UniProtKB/TrEMBL annotation, chains A, C:
<keyword id="KW-1277">Toxin-antitoxin system</keyword>
<dbReference type="InterPro" id="IPR038296">
    <property type="entry name" value="ParD_sf"/>
</dbReference>
<dbReference type="Pfam" id="PF03693">
    <property type="entry name" value="ParD_antitoxin"/>
</dbReference>
<comment type="similarity">
    <text>Belongs to the ParD antitoxin family.</text>
</comment>
<dbReference type="GO" id="GO:0006355">
    <property type="term" value="P:regulation of DNA-templated transcription"/>
</dbReference>
<dbReference type="InterPro" id="IPR010985">
    <property type="entry name" value="Ribbon_hlx_hlx"/>
</dbReference>
<protein>
    <submittedName>
        <fullName>Addiction module antidote protein, CopG/Arc/MetJ family</fullName>
    </submittedName>
</protein>
From TrEMBL, chains B, H:
<dbReference type="Pfam" id="PF05016">
    <property type="entry name" value="ParE_toxin"/>
</dbReference>
<dbReference type="InterPro" id="IPR007712">
    <property type="entry name" value="RelE/ParE_toxin"/>
</dbReference>
<dbReference type="InterPro" id="IPR051803">
    <property type="entry name" value="TA_system_RelE-like_toxin"/>
</dbReference>
<dbReference type="InterPro" id="IPR035093">
    <property type="entry name" value="RelE/ParE_toxin_dom_sf"/>
</dbReference>
<comment type="similarity">
    <text>Belongs to the RelE toxin family.</text>
</comment>
<keyword id="KW-1277">Toxin-antitoxin system</keyword>
<protein>
    <submittedName>
        <fullName>Plasmid stabilization system</fullName>
    </submittedName>
</protein>
Automatic annotation (TrEMBL), chains D, G:
<dbReference type="InterPro" id="IPR035093">
    <property type="entry name" value="RelE/ParE_toxin_dom_sf"/>
</dbReference>
<keyword id="KW-1277">Toxin-antitoxin system</keyword>
<dbReference type="InterPro" id="IPR051803">
    <property type="entry name" value="TA_system_RelE-like_toxin"/>
</dbReference>
<dbReference type="Pfam" id="PF05016">
    <property type="entry name" value="ParE_toxin"/>
</dbReference>
<comment type="similarity">
    <text>Belongs to the RelE toxin family.</text>
</comment>
<protein>
    <submittedName>
        <fullName>Plasmid stabilization system</fullName>
    </submittedName>
</protein>
<dbReference type="InterPro" id="IPR007712">
    <property type="entry name" value="RelE/ParE_toxin"/>
</dbReference>
């Protein structure tokens, strides 16, 4: 009762390698692979959500910074080169 | 034909930061990034809806890639068709510095 | 026919977040999550196999290098400090 | 701008629909709506993708999450009128990529 | 042996590296950089895997025959046909 | 702004970084180091997640009562009982 | 050296067996064989694990893939006779860790 | 009581490499790594089977961790019980330098 069963469709190539891993004794069952893979996916998903939150934070900073203006890249080059000291 | 294109104060700061960071050791590379970013912005002024919508960031946000940078911008009005009065580039983000899943 | 169905047991906590992701419109079905997760797991597995091959390579180099001898760490310190120039 | 698809790209689209449609037809339809909408945007804005000459010299990438459209313009120029866009592949990043960029 | 180089990092990165060293996670910042660059070597190999995969898929597409317009209404009907043998 | 530091990497790492720059993947080695250190920041956060998780689990174990020897024969019988309500 | 297990570690062992045993009893038995064998090795060699004072000051980790035994010695010294080993948790790295080390 | 402990020529080279790499900027850290590695090896001479078997590497291989390093070694005879005549440390591996899934 500490598991929840679900029917899932993987690609034939994926199912093949999952069977290979079990037959090699790397895992006892395909479910063990899916549990490990989904835990990793949870962490990956959180890193992706971090990215979205970071982009939103950066966006919000830009929108709060004042009146937007055109940029002259020739002028900008000179300003940046001066910041280089 | 080209719409008005403006940059947030923070986006201007992003551009200066980018140039100074790489220019501190390779000024030719700094110049090339400015050549590329200016070219991409000029394209955008001509075709204001070329960036993909990213409403998961904020509702009007659009993203245009100029590797390794991501330009975040919006059009005003925020419409899918019809006249655009300006494009505002809100940030220039270096994916190597700020993103997990890209660059 | 370009998929293979299997019944798998995930943890209740995992099943919950998978449902949350689908309900949020991040994925259409749980199968899409498993396919993505298993592809990532395939790559992770190959990095782990790389590690085992690398450890084996390093081991084999050590075994091929000649007669093993005791090490005096006080002496070894002096030799290493000389290599520092 | 004329929009055409390689025979393999058409096969990609069919495979995508069949894979998800095998359990959720509504989702399969939604993907076609999204892919068609992006392909239409691309025909209006042929250089909206990213150049990837490290793949092949004319290659460009346009994301339509979770998919990536690999395409080229003809001519393969940076400026001026485009005569057509060819979508060469439709790739599912969940199945075939470590990262998008 | 060892190769020294002068590198430019962000102030934010330098601050966290110093924090980690001061906390005893690492002995010096170079230890962090070596770990980080080794991980980047693997990331780069996975990136090259992606590029090769996309190139392979591209080449297959370019060799598959004359490109044609797609009618998505007709395409949907054809995909549903495929689903039913 | 920018922070310069002198770091020591391996000759093998330095060689691949030079290869990548010469091939046009990057403009300078510092660009690689910045990307790599940013990825390490995320790795370190995942490492801290692991440490926190292990600490949480540890603390729970230490607060659960008097430790006792385990008979694995008896334990197996008890686990099989659990499997059947 | 006396070997004891926290009540939670015993619960960990039961949960592990129930989880895999729900579909493969032979595998569940194999895991118990492996965990018992490692716990016996640990009783003979109490300091074979790695110290992890960054977790808690007396904490040690011993891998028994895919599991990690969290344990301590009493006394918590680096040398000299150990009176007992307490296994505090049995952790499945596949379910609870990004990395082992 | 302690069994004979020897190191492959390559393992000795590993030890020198480790010290020189970190010692090039922090000699106290180099010394501490030697203190720790010597201590772990002394333990191993007293308890030759404290390393976990890793037959997936090679059949007799054992691994003993001394973070961030992994000691790879074997006993001879390669038995689970009975007298050991020596321990050979075959490599000292820095996980930060050579492993994907550890350190
Ligand atoms: Na990045
Ligand atoms: Na590592």
């Amino acid at each position: 009762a500490n598991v929840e069963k679900m029917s899932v469709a993987v690609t034939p190539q994926q199912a093949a390698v999952m069977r290979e891993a079990v037959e090699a004794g790397e895992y006892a069952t395909a479910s063990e692979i899916v549990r490990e893979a989904v835990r990793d996916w949870l962490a990956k998903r959180e890193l992706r959500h971090d990215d979205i939150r970071r982009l939103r934070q950066l966006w919000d900073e830009g929108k709060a910074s004042g009146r937007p203006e055109p940029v002259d890249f020739d002028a900008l080059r000179k300003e940046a080169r001066q910041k280089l000291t | 034909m080209a719409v008005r294109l403006v940059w947030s104060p923070t986006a201007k700061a992003d551009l200066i930061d980018i140039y100074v960071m790489i220019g501190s050791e390779n000024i030719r590379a700094a110049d090339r990034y400015y050549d590329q970013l200016e070219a991409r912005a000029l394209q955008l002024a001509d075709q204001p809806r070329m960036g993909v919508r990213r409403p998961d960031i904020r509702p009007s946000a659009r993203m245009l890639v100029e590797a390794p940078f991501v330009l975040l911008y919006e059009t005003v009005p925020d419409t899918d068709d019809g006249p655009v009065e300006w494009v505002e580039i809100v940030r220039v983000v270096d994916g190597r510095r700020d993103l997990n899943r890209l660059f």
